[PDB]
Amino acid sequence: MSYNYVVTAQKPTAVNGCVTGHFTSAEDLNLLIAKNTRLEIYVVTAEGLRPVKEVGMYGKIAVMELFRPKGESKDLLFILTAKYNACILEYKQSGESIDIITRAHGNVQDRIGRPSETGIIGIIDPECRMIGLRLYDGLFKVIPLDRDNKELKAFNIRLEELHVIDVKFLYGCQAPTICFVYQDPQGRHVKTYEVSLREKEFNKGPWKQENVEAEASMVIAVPEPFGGAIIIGQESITYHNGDKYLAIAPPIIKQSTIVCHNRVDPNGSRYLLGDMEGRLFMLLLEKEEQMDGTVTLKDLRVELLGETSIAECLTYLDNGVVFVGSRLGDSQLVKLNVDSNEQGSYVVAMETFTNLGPIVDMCVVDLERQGQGQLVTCSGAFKEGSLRIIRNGIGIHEHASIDLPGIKGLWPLRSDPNRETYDTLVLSFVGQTRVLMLNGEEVEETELMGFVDDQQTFFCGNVAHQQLIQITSASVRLVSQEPKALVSEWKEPQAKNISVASCNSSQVVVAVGRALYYLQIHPQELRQISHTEMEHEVACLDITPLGDSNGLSPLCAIGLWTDISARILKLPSFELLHKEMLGGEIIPRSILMTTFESSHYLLCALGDGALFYFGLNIETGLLSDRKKVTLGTQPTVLRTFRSLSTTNVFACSDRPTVIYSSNHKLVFSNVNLKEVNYMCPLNSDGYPDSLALANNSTLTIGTIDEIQKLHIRTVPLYESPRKICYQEVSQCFGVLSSRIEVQDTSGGTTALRPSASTQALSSSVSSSKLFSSGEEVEVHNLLIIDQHTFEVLHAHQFLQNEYALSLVSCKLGKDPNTYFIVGTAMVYPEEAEPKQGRIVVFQYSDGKLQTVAEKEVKGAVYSMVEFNGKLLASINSTVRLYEWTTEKDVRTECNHYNNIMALYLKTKGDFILVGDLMRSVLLLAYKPMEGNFEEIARDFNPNWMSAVEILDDDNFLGAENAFNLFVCQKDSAATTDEERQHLQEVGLFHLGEFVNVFCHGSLVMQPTQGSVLFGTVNGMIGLVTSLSESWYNLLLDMQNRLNKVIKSVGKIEHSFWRSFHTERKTEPATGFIDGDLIESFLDISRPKMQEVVANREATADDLIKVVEELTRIH
């Protein structure tokens, strides 16, 4: 029994595919970017991309095409999951509520059929007559496109050729006709088949099988004016037709393989081409005319336009704008100019979108000496390589810290109408008021004339027309910028005390307990206006001139005491509109209004910390959407702030939250602060652009961070990092990198660009002499990286043809020094595997990288961990436990041996080990008997491992090539000379993500138990946690209910998606709860929410809170 809960802490950032077309509106341009499982939907603008709709799916997208048949208005979408899920999508707006529909769907796999090289190829014919699929090796799948076929019934046709490389449909062919590059013992060839769907046959294509090159890897079909097939290999480009053939081998393209393409002009004149280098080519075909038939071709030449992130996906948009989909680096928006600049680049970067890319390796490191952890992932590859420092929450830059206990408010102020650098600030004190004027950065408490300092201030804002306002318990006083005394004054015509207050430039609304008054400010005098009484006692008010008026405010709204409500009203007339009745038993503490780009928002905060969101129109004055969140458990004070262009909302609480803007939505995320009571914007000539803060005691000021939950740094390495270690006693990261170099004319290698190891601040190479007995070679490095600066303190280069595989930072035995230990291997392309290698013990000093001790090994050092003052390495297949003499030298002790290829290791504290390559996992014990290994138990399934972590003394988490997670634990039954020997698979699961690395740590803190983060190839960062017996049984069930209520996108069963899947079996998943689906609850309509709960107890609006305490593990 192994109860587990996985969560997506960060969505996959790798673009896996993208397309253009009119999917939103027949007169709209759309960018359709598929991630792994996500599907971003954009519309193109003068700026670039307007986000529109982002949805997940239950599957890895592998095919994504837009198509528009006859008798259809706008383009429809066709998606095919890697688990062979076909489905046809459509975008459908009901005015303001946006929906993606399922027009067709089915499952298009067969029991028979090896999946082939290059994997899935899906293609639609130009006439929309069908959908052709090469799912399987040797067959071709047809989905005959009809008005019927809502379940996409598909017939297969036999293929004589069982190795296809690429296939397209050809324009201008009588029937539907395919075109492809196949392989056989003679080499590579081109062939066409006419696909008649009447007879379910393949007939014969419009032109005879010709011959393409022994590296051909792309068929590009060409549109109506031309017709034909452009075929791309290495070092050559061919154009094929009836008997027309054209070819060119431009030395430029030879250098690296053209990987992805794309048509720029509809008439198929200009095409874009991607490389492993990131080079952006322009394929141009020359128009030739005989003038009475159509148009032929004279030639076709290729020009190098510039440089992109290693393009996996490619799409031209409106005007020059090219979206570059990267997998190994940050995707980006790129402009094609007509003119070159410096270095001859017709390419100009517009925007660069953060891809956390191939996460090869990472670790959890504080770097702030708090309790929270930053994560530092080795991301990217080749020129795109980088470290990413991922920091959870928005943080504060502090400047001054004055110790004042019992502050009650603060508002922006100036003592000169000229400078907008607010040189003053007045705070509310414990029934008192003290002045704070600034000599600059000097905190000065004096008296100010016309301001009372023994009463308690309620408001103190910037009333324009030369005046300073001070509403307090009794009177609302007034000061000017000409005399500075009692310029005017207002008093309640009874001697009753004012309670609630709201004020802007030339407008004031107060409350005397149910009583209301509206004021005005002009030159020098305080003039009163209208008055109305109200149902109960006023708890809060708000007034502010919005985006439709200059200093004066149109409509209005409040919330009062007894009924516990939120009232919509008018201002001068004081009439009552459509209030929103609220539940609860505590007052509403704060109420506000805001404006961003497009929309107006009415927010109300409660006393027990909760918050409700509604939309008050500047015109209509009507309701909007309802939902409940938790913040802290204290009252929440709502303020407005200046940041960038989008100026936003700060929620003060015991758990401080900020409200930015995402796409049109309002962000809602944590703020790294002790506890925050009251807050305001600033801009003094001692602290500009600052935000002011107060709590129990102590003021703070200083600029605010970014937006979002996850902050991302990025330290561009320009090469490719393999693993990372954190020596904290040293205050620096050790990172293994790798650069590719080219054979040169003399006999050595050089470099292609300035990398991290080359332009390193200080370097050293290896001197060991232990070995004897069109060319690219990887060069490897340890890098020393300052944790504060992230500069390259040092870069050590390893030997020739030596790769550095593994890294540890530890103290070994009674050696007081901490070390860097690097496992390595010697690689040359004859041997299938290494039969050599090293183990180097590096020591970093004041600022010096010392080679302390080396050791030879007859095989690759795959991983290694600090066991117990002893070093535990895996050497190709022997797993050996080294110890550390006083000699300062690695001496052997024991070494197991029952492995195929020991790729990974993890240590459970005391004396326990794990992990293999193509035969699942093992479990070992070190015996302080004679320092001898004893194989405790092993998993007997045939998994192709990729990642291993020990969760606890029994739960072992493994990840594997087929994107599946599993969990092992030892059988606790009798007859333990056999049943002990096997450890059973107590939990399977389909993440749908290649897992590179696991480790312990959390991105938060100063309901569950444990915490294990993982990084994946697609850049997704996950979180595994272990569960308590009851919490599972509830969650698995409420997970089962959610399937019935949530309408799947491609109409895909969630339980199917989550099922364990290798080529040779499929099981439904046990012991695994994706909180992703659990988190799906909090974004449900209340009607479909009540459904989930029909049935120790079961509530309704109590689970809404349990799913809260979950979205707080990351």
């Binding site: 190994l328 090869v360 393999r722 990887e778 291997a825 690689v827 299938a832 690759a860 790729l903 190839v1017």
Partner: peptide, 13 residues
């Protein structure tokens, strides 16, 4: 080889 495979399995095909 075994390693030319292992710096490509950490990246994807």
């Amino acid at each position: 080889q075994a390693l030319p495979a292992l710096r490509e399995r950490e990246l994807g095909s």
